[PDB]
Symmetry: D2
Subunit: 113 residues, 4 copies
């Protein structure tokens, strides 16, 4: 699991469950092509998005559908989504973590091994 | 002004100065159009991006060039940029302050929305 | 003023108004002494806590009464308060802005330190 | 493991390793008595601080020695430490997470089950 996503809910102090996540890779023509996607689990994690062979150096975007999550809870949100854009470079494992509030979010990368 | 951007450096505990900011607005055909741009001042603030009549309802994107900032300081950061996407003025005009707090492998963004 | 406190509400995307703030200074005998206090204004800011001559070197604690704020809004928050502890003016006088960003089960605090 | 602590480093995008953590419980005389302590592991986690029998309702403080961590890395820090104070109330498990920068930190509680 070279790439993992973890989402937390700052309002309820819990994992953010069933949040849609989309991963894109930047293409030569500079547009974003879909690469992988999923929903966070009960623990607010999304595993299995990709593999070591597949996850080559490049620029990647992770898009988290924050707005649907807040809508689900009946709380007005500010952001359309939360977007994280990064260069992967060459034995690393990437965890993209996000902490969510209706009017704020924080994202962090934990890069290890 | 109805849109202001404020950037802070969590490493040095200072305003993040001379940070490029680009604003886009989603067009009818679903493309992003250039709306405004500028750089943060000595205070880490960017004022004067737009006006009340220009800043109509829509979906707006604020892209903060975090990578260039960190690189200029000798640091190779994780993120390409910090992007904030939002619907504006849906319920009538408001004043928006977009704040970003920057670290090399993390950032937080917050909106303060007030009623003119 | 050399010490200012700014509080924001991450839920409502607004300044956190009428938030009690208490400041203490570590005494010679290692006890915390009352230094100053106040409440955040409509802008979420608290000014006028102290003066340049009063605000000498030392270790300072700023306790923000987050619990009362959330409770007044109907929310039972995780934290009792948000506490910020820091050495001040160790290298000569500085201006300190202590910022807090509040959510019911989370908070962030940041210091902006500038040279008068 | 009713109580767990997780610390991350926002500068290096990594777990915050070997960070000292102290847990206190508020006593009737209103002072803090030491309850438990440890250092974060390689994964930036501290487990085994307490047990279900032991971890009764009360007000607890978790103190993270952020300043020593930054000193270890040669980076000037603002805070003396990061303090998290909370009421535990009654089948919960508590994870206290902290994200560290030299001039800023964020803490979040993930409370589950
Ligand atoms: O100093 C300011 C600091 C912040 C701020 C504080 C914490 C954050 O985690 C964040 O993402 C932004 O937000 C502000 C928002 C303001 O309207 C004015 C300010 O001076 C600040
Ligand atoms: O990677 C983790 C990252 C975070 C986290 C992420 C962002 C924050 O602003 C914060 O304050 C904590 O919280 C976690 C919380 C967990 O329970 C497990 C984890 O692995 C993480």
């Amino acid at each position: 699991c070279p790439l993992m996503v973890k989402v937390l809910d700052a309002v309820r102090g819990s994992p953010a469950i069933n949040v849609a996540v989309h991963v894109f890779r930047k293409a030569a023509d500079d547009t974003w092509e879909p690469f992988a996607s999923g929903k966070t689990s009960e623990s607010g994690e999304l595993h299995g998005l990709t593999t070591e062979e597949e996850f080559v150096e490049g620029i990647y975007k992770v898009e988290i559908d924050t707005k649907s999550y807040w809508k689900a809870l009946g709380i007005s949100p500010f952001h359309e989504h939360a977007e994280v854009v990064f260069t992967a470079n060459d034995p690393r494992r990437y965890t993209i973590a996000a902490l969510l509030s209706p009017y704020s979010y924080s994202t962090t990368a934990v890069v290890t091994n």
